[PDB]
Structure 1
Amino acid sequence: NYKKPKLLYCSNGGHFLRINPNGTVDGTRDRSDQHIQLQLSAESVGEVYIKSTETGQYLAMDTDGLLYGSQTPNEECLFLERLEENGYNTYISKKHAEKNWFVGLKKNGSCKRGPRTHYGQKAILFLPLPVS
């Protein structure tokens, strides 16, 4: 199911995860935005890389839990993808997995930093959707 690109929709504020050309990561309510098309791929079961098709940058999480775009797919870019019972997917930073730092978007579209994320919050629930 990683064969084609997709959008990652956050049910908290209704934002599509966006990797901007300048390297910042946020969300947008505009489904037509060119920077929300993402290619997910898995080298190992349950572990994914999430890449911007438009800029080639990989989603990554820094040491303070902020999401950013990385030119290279390194250890900071691996996420543990889990399918929750409510049917939503969650993504935990593999590097920061002991701390349960999730990929998350606030209601205003800004990244909810890893340490502020917690299981049970709407900010961490994502729905993979077809591009068009």
Structure 2
Amino acid sequence: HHHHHFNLPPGNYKKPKLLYCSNGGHFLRILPDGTVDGTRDRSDQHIQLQLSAESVGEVYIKSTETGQYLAMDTDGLVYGSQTPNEECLFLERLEENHYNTYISKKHAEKNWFLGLKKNGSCKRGPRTHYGQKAILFLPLPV
């Protein structure tokens, strides 16, 4: 449980999705250069993601266009990794009985989440907190 609640979101990983952030109304984007951000452009070719489960509640978020894995570094910066490693795992949970939240597994004890600012920039791990809108995501069909 990693010392966290276990309310899981409904749905599956059968198909790819878009991870939509309410905060600024952005879709999670993994750039070929390893850069990660958010875009409002629904036609962007780098927003399609494939989630997969490691263990129950643990996921990988992979770019279908590039094959890169979403990850969060030692300093809390989100990046795109060519290969899957411990920094690529996230704890996917339901939040506010509706949204999906993604907590860095490696940094779970610190509550470091995946989050997008209103300007579409990713937030740094330590800057994320329960209660913010930046951490709330909606998985949409592609």
Using the size of structure 2 for normalisation, the TM-score is 0.91
How far has the Cα of 1:86 moved from its partner? 3.7
What per-residue deviation string (whole Å, max 9, x for no partner) do you get for residues 23-59 of structure 1? Answer: 0100000011000000000020000000000000000
What per-residue deviation string (whole Å, max 9, x for no partner) do you get for residues 59-116 of structure 1? Answer: 0001111110000111000000001134000000000000000000000000111100
Matched, 1:58 2:69: yes
Q: Which runs of 5+ in 1 are unaligned?
A: none
User: Which has more helix, going by share of residues?
Assistant: 1
Q: 1:122 is paired with a residue of what secondary structure?
A: coil
Q: Distance in 2 between matches of 1:85 and 1:17?
A: 20
Please give the root-mean-square deviation of Cα atoms over the aligned residues, in Å. Answer: 0.6
Q: Distance in 2 between matches of 1:85 and 1:102?
A: 15
Q: Which runs of 5+ in 2 are unaligned?
A: 1-11
**Equivalence for 1:41:** 52
Q: Distance in 2 between matches of 1:23 and 1:88?
A: 26
Q: Distance in 2 between matches of 1:9 and 1:66?
A: 19
Q: 1:129 is paired with a residue of what secondary structure?
A: strand
Using the size of structure 1 for normalisation, the TM-score is 0.98
Could you tell me the percent identity over the aligned residues? 96
Q: 1:1-132 counterparts in 2 under 5 A?
A: 1-131=12-142
Q: Distance in 1 between matches of 2:124 and 2:94?
A: 21
Aligned length: 131
